[PDB]
Structure formats: C-alpha cells, structure tokens
Paper text:
Localization studies for BBA14 and BBG25 have indicated that BBA14 is surface exposed, but BBG25 is most likely attached to the outer membrane and faces the periplasm.
Crystals of BBA14 were obtained by using the recombinant protein BBA1426–121, which corresponds to the full-length protein except the N-terminal signal peptide. The crystals were in space group P41212, with one molecule per asymmetric unit. In the obtained crystal structure, the last three C-terminal residues 119–121 were not modeled due to weak electron density, while at the N-terminus, also the residues Ala-Met-Gly remaining after TEV protease digestion were modeled. The α-helices are connected by a 20 amino acid loop region; thus, αA and αB are placed in parallel. Additionally, there is an N-terminal loop region comprising 15 amino acids; given that BBA14 is a lipoprotein, this loop likely serves as a flexible region that connects the folded region to the cell membrane. BBA14 and the antitoxin epsilon from S. pyogenes showed high overall fold similarity (Cα root-mean-square deviation of 2.90 Ǻ) but only 20% amino acid sequence identity. Although there is a noticeable structural variability at the loop regions, the α-helices that in the S. pyogenes antitoxin are responsible for the interaction with the toxin are largely conserved.
Numbering used by the authors:
A (entry chain A), B (entry chain A): 24 to 118
Write the structure that this text describes.
Amino acid sequence: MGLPEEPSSPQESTLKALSLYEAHLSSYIMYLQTFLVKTKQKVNNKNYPEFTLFDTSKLKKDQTLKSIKTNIAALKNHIDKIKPIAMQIYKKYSK
Amino acid sequence: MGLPEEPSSPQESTLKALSLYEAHLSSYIMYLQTFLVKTKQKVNNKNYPEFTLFDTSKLKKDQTLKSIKTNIAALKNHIDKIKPIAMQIYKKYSK
C-alpha cells in the first residue's frame, strides 16, 4: 500500500487533538526513519542518501499546550527533511 | 487519519517484493511502538497496558529469501501482540 500518508493537522486546537497529532507525527517519523535504515541495509551502495536521525532532546516533556505546539513544529520541520528522501528510496527500490 | 493500516503481503514472492514487505512491517511496528510509548507518556495511570518492545536480535541479517521470509514471520507475530493494544489506546485517548 506504499508509504503511509503524513498525518493531517486537526481542525480543533484542543490539548487532546494536538497531543494526538504530536503522537502521530512522532510515530510517522519513526516509520520513515525505520524504512530508510532498513532500505540502506538491503542496498548499501556509497550513493545511499544522508539523513538526520530525529533528536528527541529537541522535544519539550511538560504537556503544556504551548510545549505541544512547539514539538509539533519541530516534528513537522524534521518530516520536511526526511519525507522526500524516504519517497525517493521507496521508488528506487520498488522499481 | 487514524492509525496506519498494517502493510499488505505482496502477491509476488520475489526477493524484492518480500524485502520491501519486511521493511514496511519493521516500519509499521516502529510506528505502533512509538504511538504506544508517546501515549503512555501523556496518560501514565498504572492501568496503562503492558507491551513487548520488538527484539531486533530475532531478525536474520543475511538477505537470503529464506531469512527474509523468516523475519516476515517474526514481525507478523509481533504485530499480532501489539496492534490490538495500539488500537485500544488510540480509541481510549481520542474519546
């Protein structure tokens, strides 16, 4: 069924909507990172693209609506780095 | 968009079809595990269900069609342990 879709942002900016969205984004990053690491293992030519592993030290741990919104930003910025690479490696190796 | 769907098994039992399926299954497990760990952090009542973290030492590293098929089995057995828990925690906390 191909790679999973990036989670969609809730309409509702409630603590629970945003907390769930943070969890999905973290989970989606881990799917993409795992896919990139496992695909590197199977075809490990020196050409294999370079990716940042997400640094969880950039995530606030305190459950504030403010800290959740800040984490969402950090996760979205990381997705923008790795999603295009994941999608290119998926195509390269499903060819 | 809810939790992602478990990857579907290819029709084709080719090395490439099975290797890609192994990568998706590993990636899907990491999505579910991350979702379970992040959801435990947000609601950490003593009731929170108990899950096995996947042991990558149970995975063969040698790219044999035989070793890939064996890894697929191990990953599918782990999904059967954690998918129902992930789906229940998703509902509990999207309530």
